[PDB]
Amino acid sequence: EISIKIETYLQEEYGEEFEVLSWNQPKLLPSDNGAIYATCISKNDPKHPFEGSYFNPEEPNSEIEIIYDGYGQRLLAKQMESMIEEAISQAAENYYIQGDIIIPEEWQDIPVEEISQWKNYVDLCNQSNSDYKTLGSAWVYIDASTMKGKTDEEEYQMYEEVYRDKLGGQALLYVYYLDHKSFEKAEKILEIFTSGDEGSNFEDIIEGQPYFGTIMRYGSDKFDDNLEIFKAAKQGK
């Protein structure tokens, strides 16, 4: 089975045990043996899945080939999530922070021990004022019923600090203020699918809910959208 091959590889490669929640192999005919896209979790971080790209050869008992396992990428997402959580955990009780960091083909060969250190990743991304890479995006989903009463100014200031002082490059922030029941349904989907691959029913749950979307550009200490835009977005108008 393809799942067991992927699980066995990840465990042998990284020491921990993993689970392939699901996998996908787009192809028009069953005869095509295109790339296999697997949604995986480590048992130690079971609520935050990551995608890996594999090829499974034709003949029997074939050892699975790795296009890109996605684990170095996941470790970078885990850190992005952690740094945002330092602010989000003071703003609300229930939430889901989804890191969306994509390592390009050029860097996939870099050893995981090297690339997974945030400092090295930022160095790789920040080449010049003309040659830079967006570090990533954070998709934060908050249960609006469980806010901790920090003022809008205090909340915004904390995010500004994470993006300016902690992340260290060009990055985007999305904060959805979902109603309780919406959040709880959302969370169940986010636990088993990666960023962007949540599905149409997820899009239906979050549609119309108030959210704030912005970017802190390369060489900028502030977000493109000021406090006033944040307050308006948080109400929804």
Number of domains, the chain = 2
Residue 50 to residue 42: CA distance in whole angstroms: 9
Query: What is each CA distance from 124 to 39, 77, 104, 144, 217, in whole angstroms?
Result: 26, 16, 11, 37, 16
Helix locations, 15-111, DSSP H? 71-91
Same domain, 122 and 198: yes
In the sheet with 18-24, reading across from the earlier edge strand, the strands are 18-24, 36-42, 50-55, 65-68
Pair type for strands 95-100 and 65-68: unpaired
CA dihedral 154, 159, 160, 165 (to 10 degrees): 120
- Structure-solving method: X-ray
Same domain, 37 and 119: no
Number of DSSP helices (H) and strands (E) in the chain, helices first: 8, 8
What would you report as the CA-atom Rg of the chain, rounded to the nearest whole angstrom? 19
Beta carbons within 8 Å of 183's beta carbon, 6+ residues apart? 94, 141, 142, 143, 144, 145
CATH of the domain at 148: 3.10.310.80
Same domain, 111 and 48: no
| Structural resolution in Å | 2.5
78 neighbors 112 (Cβ within 8 angstroms): no
Q: Which of 65, 82, 99 is the last residue of a domain?
A: 82
Angle at the Cα of 123 from the Cα atoms of 136 and 170, rounded to 5 degrees = 35
Residue 84 to residue 89: CA distance in whole angstroms: 9
Same domain, 31 and 55: yes
Same domain, 171 and 209: yes
Measured in whole angstroms, the distance separating CA 144 from the mean position of its chain's CA atoms is: 21
Same domain, 115 and 163: yes
Tracing tokens 């920090």 back to the chain, one arrives at: 150
Same domain, 116 and 164: yes
Tracing tokens 């699901």 back to the chain, one arrives at: 22
Residue 13 to residue 42: CA distance in whole angstroms: 12
Same domain, 115 and 28: no
Q: Which of 82, 111, 128 is the last residue of a domain?
A: 82
- Using alpha carbons, select from 203, 161, 164 the residue that is nearest to residue 186: 203
